[PDB]
Amino acid sequence: ANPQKLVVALLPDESAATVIQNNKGLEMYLENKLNKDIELFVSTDYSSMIEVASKGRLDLAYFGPLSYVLAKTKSNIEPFAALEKDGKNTYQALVIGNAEAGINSYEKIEGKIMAYGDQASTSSHLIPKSMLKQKQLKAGENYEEVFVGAHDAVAIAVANGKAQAGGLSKPIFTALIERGTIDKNKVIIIAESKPFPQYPWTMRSDLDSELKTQIQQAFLELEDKAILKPFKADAFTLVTDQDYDVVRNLGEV
């Protein structure tokens, strides 16, 4: 209940060095506020994060929405905060196409290779897959799916031409363009999803009351631009479990 050190896991939605480096600023702030030491953990894939969480081995975990839903079925954890941008607490998936191949509509996806990220990804699997299904594209019926493991790997493949289309997170696509990792004109945005709730920061439920409240507070109070720059976020807001029922519903269907 009162750990001297805090194990903090971060979703491997991109390469580990990108993820680690994005949260370094936030790690330092949380050391100063909680007066505790933090070791970051970035798993090899989303499923191994979910496993590590299900051992009671993590103190905090920054999960994606679907991965949170899956981890919560077998882990004693509690969502408490999520990024806010422009007083909004949500985010979008994109469907993108390879521009050389002229992949600029849903109809051009038919009979081609569609890149997804991790199988437990919300915005690089579940969401883009539902968007494709609403448009009568079904995996292994009228197109071929490949799982390339991460959002940055999706962007890379689609821009390369190894895949003709892909599904990934709109903020990650945006960061990738701004950092120069991907050339913008090699990819065409086909569609954007509806709003889904942002990734939940979660904590272990059997943590001490006063520590749980201190952690939540630390997030809610954070205001400086430099620390949130790698997420293009103005703040954190609070979230609860029920906010993820929209994701469960889509996961059910």
Numbering used by the authors: 10 to 262
Sentences from the paper on this structure:
Here we elucidate the molecular basis of high-affinity phosphite and hypophosphite acquisition by determining the ligand-binding affinity and structure of the PBPs of phosphite and hypophosphite ABC transporters from environmental microorganisms.
To determine the structural mechanism of phosphite selectivity we co-crystallised Te_PtxB and Pm_PhnD with phosphite resulting in high-resolution structures (1.95 and 1.46 Å respectively) of the closed, ligand-bound complexes. In the closed form, the amino acids that form the walls of the binding pocket pack tightly against the phosphite moiety and a single water molecule that is also buried in the binding pocket. Each oxygen atom of the phosphite contributes to an extensive hydrogen bonding network to the main chain and side chains of a cluster of conserved residues from lobe 2 (Te_PtxB; Y55, Y100, S130, T131, S132 and H160; Pm_PhnD; Y46, S126, T127, S128, H158 and D205, Figs. 1d, e and 2e, f). In Te_PtxB, it is not possible to determine the protonation state of the phosphite from the pattern of hydrogen bonding, but given the pH of the crystallisation experiment (pH 4.2), it is also likely that the mono-anionic form of phosphite is bound (phosphite pKa 1.5, 6.739). However, in Te_PtxB, one imidazole nitrogen atom acts as a hydrogen bond acceptor to a mainchain N-H (S178), suggesting that the histidine is neutral. This tyrosine sidechain forms a cap that is stabilised by intramolecular hydrogen bonds to residues on lobe 1 (Te_PtxB; D22, Pm_PhnD; D13 and N176), which in the closed conformation, contributes to the network of interactions that connect both lobes of the protein and bury the binding pocket from solvent.
